[PDB]
Amino acid sequence: RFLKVKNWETEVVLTDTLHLKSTLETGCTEYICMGSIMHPSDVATKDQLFPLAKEFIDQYYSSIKRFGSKAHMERLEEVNKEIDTTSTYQLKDTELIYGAKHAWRNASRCVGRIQWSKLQVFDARDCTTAHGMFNYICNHVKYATNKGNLRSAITIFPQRTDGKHDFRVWNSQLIRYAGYKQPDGSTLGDPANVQFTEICIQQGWKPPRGRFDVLPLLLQANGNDPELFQIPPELVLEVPIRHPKFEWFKDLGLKWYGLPAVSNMLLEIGGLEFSACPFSGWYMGTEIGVRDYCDNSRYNILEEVAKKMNLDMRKTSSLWKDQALVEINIAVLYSFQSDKVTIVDHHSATESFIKHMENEYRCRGGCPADWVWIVPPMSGSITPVFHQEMLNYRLTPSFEYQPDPWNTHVWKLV
Amino acid sequence: PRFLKVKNWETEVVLTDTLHLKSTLETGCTEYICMGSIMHPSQHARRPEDVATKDQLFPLAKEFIDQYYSSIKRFGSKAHMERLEEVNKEIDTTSTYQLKDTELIYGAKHAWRNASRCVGRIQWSKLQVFDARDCTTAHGMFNYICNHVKYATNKGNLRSAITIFPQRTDGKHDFRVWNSQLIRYAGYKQPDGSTLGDPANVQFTEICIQQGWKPPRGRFDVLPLLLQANGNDPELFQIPPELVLEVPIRHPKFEWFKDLGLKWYGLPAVSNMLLEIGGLEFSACPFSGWYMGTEIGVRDYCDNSRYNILEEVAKKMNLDMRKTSSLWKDQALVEINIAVLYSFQSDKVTIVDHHSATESFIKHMENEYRCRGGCPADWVWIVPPMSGSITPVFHQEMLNYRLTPSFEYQPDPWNTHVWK
Ligand code: HEM
Ligand code: HEM
Ligand SMILES: C[C@H](O)[C@H](O)[C@H]1CNc2nc(N)[nH]c(=O)c2N1
Ligand SMILES: C[C@H](O)[C@H](O)[C@H]1CNc2nc(N)[nH]c(=O)c2N1
Ligand SMILES: CNCCCc1cc(C)cc(N)n1
Ligand SMILES: CNCCCc1cc(C)cc(N)n1
Ligand SMILES: [Zn+2]
């Protein structure tokens, strides 16, 4: 069986055979599409783990042209031994690297996947304490930041065992700014992080109470209560935002951090669950300029920018929001480029994704892709992905969402 | 199971959908694959190829009549049972049946109500329905369409309307409007290789010329109507220009913008879709409303395989066009959409910006969840093609499913018509 996808701007048609390899739910049914649901909705038994592990080992030995080899059969046998005796198993280094890259390659919501095979994998499965996690994460940040010449990386902590000894980074990203609700109902800093800021303050963090306080790391090892650590400031690269034409823009006092690093997701490889696996790349400009700065629930600077632009803010149909949004996004890109911090604009990024997508169809039989997430949050139809049909399905290895740790952790102190 | 929630991530409002339990045909998606960005994911239809047997048509007829009599707090009433028996005899003796005027109006309005790709549906029950089922010729079709266009245009105070020509019978006698919209501009393949006018319409424009249309060969030549009645060869008709309201595009600050010489028509009137009610297929059912500005200014003017005028606007704005990261395309894109909205509003032609339209749709969703238990919506199509996330629909989860009556796509008639 085959499925065709068409680009309505170029008329190119690609043929997806890879979707036959999926085996997890999309959330949709034959009569309902849930393609726009954010999350369409504790450990595997021995019998469940066996075929998951086999499927992965089979896929890895196939990836390296060794399917059916004596080394393939011996690995299968070895894995079955571990599951039988210990109810789990341990990946080889080569399998871990392969699995981490393919979770990225399989990430249907990610437009930056042309880069998937250039991922630096840091094996942290020997870590046992939150201090050790802090060390590993500092090394990751320093390596990935590379003085502005950003390099993709992931650090992988010990896999889940019984579910009572999970490793977790409680932060949603490694570097994010604090948010403080004020008595008058206003918000200082990032409104998205108000809740996590409260948790930190409660654990003993002394907040500077400013607009751009880098949050501390809150790190949990082996199921223990999480612990606070301050990332050394010299490892946090930041970019002050200015505009190439509006000299007043710098007077907004805006800045952002250079390294985007998701730390709250779960990496599944061969049925094993890596609940702490922070990974980092580099920014597409609209992530900061459209969402981070201009979401109503975020920094929400459209009004102030539009005021300084003297826009007619009485009618929506003046498109003052649209005009201000573009300029903010110009500033963001000009600022990172001036400081020689890696960043990609949404036009360049989506153009590379189409080339990546077509290469994937040729060499792999397809490329699962989430149009709802791939299309940038501004100027959608002037990017090539808008006109690109895409098929969404779930391949494993994969990155998965997981409950926030403060909703499931049971505390131990006092 | 028997309820699905959708969340708005800006407001945290959650809505609970039970209406999807009434969905009739396949979305194309499965457990394992989502086809939500496929233009035509499914060929699942309610009636086969053409002239159905009794056991194929009657169950669909009964379902629609049942739904209509339930809608008006009857069901099982005397008139409902007689209507069932009347449709039964009509199918028995003609292999089809005829809708009452009330059923036809109910069906048209509910096809619009069920149109998951339409952001305009808060207006769904305010639709003027012109019954053109007595039409027999392309000349009569022309007369019906002129009246529709004049009524709908209403000197700029646009009014939504649909004109419904006779239903399909055996599939060799279809009524068709060959135009994709009642009013579009021609597109001309130039000798060097470029394209003059609207590149979307090059094929249709060439069919028209091949049918004896004499093209003025300009950038905004209103195409003729190409009308097909009762399966005969289609015939060309020129819409009287006084019925075709147009808006010259100017900009409220760039005085040079008018010198671009751009304009657009006021009336968007889709004429290539198929209206399905109770198993009956109306292959010619032109419907019109009024524009959301982005439809002209983002897609019509700025798509690559359309008018592609970002280039010119950008030069005149003196933007840096060396690299993409200057966002010169984004910047010109905004100015063009400002001009369009300013131009329509200045001439008092109905138009809605994408901020107002998406706000109305969120309110329409809330209304529909409250009274109907759900609202089918296609996020891929509802979210505007610019500034997506500063509109409220971007942050609104939506469920998509296929309710009947409905508007369906159908093949372009020149791929299927056997000429005489
Ligand atoms: C290298 C440059 C990269 C770029 C430009 C990029 C870009 C993006 C963008 C724009 C999104 C949408 C995120 C949002 O709007 O919140 C995204 C999502 C995602 N990316 Fe990439 N990314 C990059 C690297 C990576 C790497 C290295 C990984 C994993 C090793 C990764 C995995 C993911 C995943 C799992 C998501 C989905 C996150 C979610 O659903 O919340 N990406 N990426
Ligand atoms: C009254 C104001 C209306 C507005 C502002 C509006 C807006 C829109 C927009 C922006 C689209 C996306 C189409 C595109 O981007 O090409 C659309 C699609 C659609 N609308 Fe509405 N619409 C209106 C009236 C109507 C009416 C009166 C009907 C039917 C009686 C209708 C039925 C549909 C259908 C069936 C589609 C899908 C068409 C397709 O897939 O090509 N709309 N509408
Ligand atoms: C591939 C993609 O589905 C296709 O280009 C769609 C996307 N969303 C759209 N949305 C609207 N309103 N109009 C369109 O033509 C499209 N095109
Ligand atoms: C409701 C909707 O699914 C939600 O707002 C999505 C839409 N598309 C997105 N696309 C990206 N890249 N990031 C997002 O957070 C979202 N949010
Ligand atoms: C959930 N989205 C937040 C940030 C997503 C992301 C991740 C990565 C690795 C790079 C990037 N540019 N963006
Ligand atoms: C492919 N759709 C083109 C036109 C869509 C449309 C239809 C109607 C009735 C109104 C509107 N504002 N837009
Ligand atoms: Zn789907």
* Residue with token string 């028996």: B85
Q: Among residues A118, A55, A26, A4, which one has the least CA distance to residue A361?
A: A4
Query: Which of B110, B117, B157, B352 for a ligand 2 pocket mutation test, highest count of atoms within 8 Å of Cβ?
Result: B117
- Contact list, B298 vs chain A (CB under 8 Å): 381-382
- Contact list, A27 vs chain B (CB under 8 Å): 34
Nearest CA to ligand 5 atom 1: A262
Could you tell me which residues of A are annotated as the binding site?
36, 110, 173, 282-283, 287, 372-373, 386, 401
A284 touches ligand 5 (CB under 6 Å): yes
Q: Do A28 and B36 touch (CB under 8 A)?
A: yes
Question: Considering only residues 14 to 73 of chain B, which have any Cβ-Cβ distance to chain A shorter than 8 Å?
Answer: 20, 23, 25-39
- Contact list, A6 vs chain B (CB under 8 Å): 39
Residues whose CB falls within 8 Å of the CB of residue B365, separated by 6 or more in sequence, listed in order:
B15, B375, B377, B396, B398
**Ligand nearest to the CA of residue B305, numbered in listed order:** 3
B263 touches ligand 4 (CB under 6 Å): no
Burial A238-257 (b: 16+ CB within 10 A, else e): bbebbbeebeebeebebebb
**Chain Cα centroid distance, residue A201:** 25
Q: Is A314 exposed, middle or buried (0-12, 13-18, 19+ CB in 10 A)?
A: exposed
- Contact list, A366 vs chain B (CB under 8 Å): none
Domain ranges across chain A: 16-125+152-162+266-280+350-374, 126-151+166-237+401-405, 238-260+283-348
B397 touches ligand 4 (CB under 6 Å): yes
Quick one: closest CA in A to B39, which residue?
A389
* Residue with token string 């704005």: B317
Q: Is B73 exposed, middle or buried (0-12, 13-18, 19+ CB in 10 A)?
A: exposed
CA B290 to ligand 2: nearest atom: 2
CB pairs under 8 A between A and B: 207
Whether B29 contacts A37, CB under 8 Å: no
Closest Cα in chain A, distance from residue B27 (Å): 5
Whether B200 contacts B187, CB under 8 Å: yes
* Residue with token string 């470029």: B194
CA A143, A145, A147, A148 dihedral sign is positive
Look up B112 and say whether it is catalytic.
no
- As annotated, the active-site residues of A are 110, 113, 282, 287
A298 touches ligand 4 (CB under 6 Å): no
Q: Is B40 exposed, middle or buried (0-12, 13-18, 19+ CB in 10 A)?
A: exposed
Lining ligand 6 with CB less than 6 A are B 268, 270, 287-292, 295
Nearest CA to ligand 3 atom 14: B381
CA A376 to ligand 4: nearest atom: 12
Interface test with A, best of B30, B34, B338 (most A CBs within 10 A): B34
CA atoms of A201 and A205, how far apart (whole Å): 5
Total number of residues shown for chain A: 414
Q: How far is the CA of A378 from the centre of ligand 3 (A)?
A: 15
CA A283 to ligand 5: nearest atom: 12
Give the relative orientation of helices A46-63 and A70-86 as an angle to the nearest 10 degrees: 160
Output the six-digit token pair for A367.
């490329």
H-run or E-run covering B195: strand B195-197
Three-state DSSP class for residue B48: coil
Look up B306 and say whether it is catalytic.
no
CA A279 to ligand 5: nearest atom: 9
CA atoms of B235 and B178, how far apart (whole Å): 10
CA A262 to ligand 5: nearest atom: 7
Q: What beta strand segments (E) does B268-375 contain?
A: 269-270, 274-277, 280-282, 287-288, 291-292, 351-352
The answer to whether the peptide bond before residue B376 is cis (omega within 30 degrees of 0) is no
Nearest CA to ligand 4 atom 13: A373
A303 touches ligand 3 (CB under 6 Å): no
Question: Considering only residues 287 to 326 of chain B, which have any Cβ-Cβ distance to chain A shorter than 8 Å?
Answer: 293, 298-299, 302-305, 310, 324-326
CA atoms of A270 and A50, how far apart (whole Å): 9
Residues linked to residue B195 through DSSP beta bridges, in sequence order: B189
A360 touches ligand 5 (CB under 6 Å): no
Range B85-90 contact pairs with CB under 8 angstroms and sequence separation of 24 or more: B87/B58, B87/B61, B87/B62, B88/B58
Q: How far is the CA of B118 from the centre of ligand 2 (A)?
A: 4
Residues whose CB falls within 8 Å of the CB of residue A321, separated by 6 or more in sequence, listed in order:
A302, A306, B355, B387, B390
Q: Is B156 exposed, middle or buried (0-12, 13-18, 19+ CB in 10 A)?
A: middle
Could you tell me which residues of B are annotated as the binding site for L-arginine?
181, 290-291, 295
Residues whose CB falls within 8 Å of the CB of residue A239, separated by 6 or more in sequence, listed in order:
A255, A256, A257, A258, A335, A336, A339, A341
CA atoms of B9 and B27, how far apart (whole Å): 25
Output the six-digit token pair for A56.
């992965």
Range A211-214 contact pairs with CB under 8 angstroms and sequence separation of 24 or more: A211/A177, A211/A253, A212/A177, A212/A238, A212/A255, A213/A177, A213/A178, A213/A189, A214/A175, A214/A176, A214/A177, A214/A178, A214/A257
Q: Among residues B174, B180, B168, B240, which one has the least CA distance to residue B207?
A: B180
Q: Do B330 and A333 touch (CB under 8 A)?
A: no
Of B325, B353, B389, the CB nearest to A291: B389
Q: How far is the CA of B119 from the centre of ligand 3 (A)?
A: 13
A334 touches ligand 5 (CB under 6 Å): no
DSSP state at residue B196: E
Task: Kindly name the residue from B235, B276, B281, B295 that is annotated as catalytic.
Answer: B295
Task: Kindly name the residue from B112, B124, B290, B328 that is annotated as catalytic.
Answer: B290
**Ligand nearest to the CA of residue B34, numbered in listed order:** 7
Whether A344 contacts A337, CB under 8 Å: no
Q: How far is the CA of B404 from the centre of ligand 2 (A)?
A: 17
Query: B93 touching A, CB under 8 A?
Result: no
Q: Gaps in chain A (C–N > 2.5 Å) come after which residues?
A: 41
Method used experimentally: X-ray
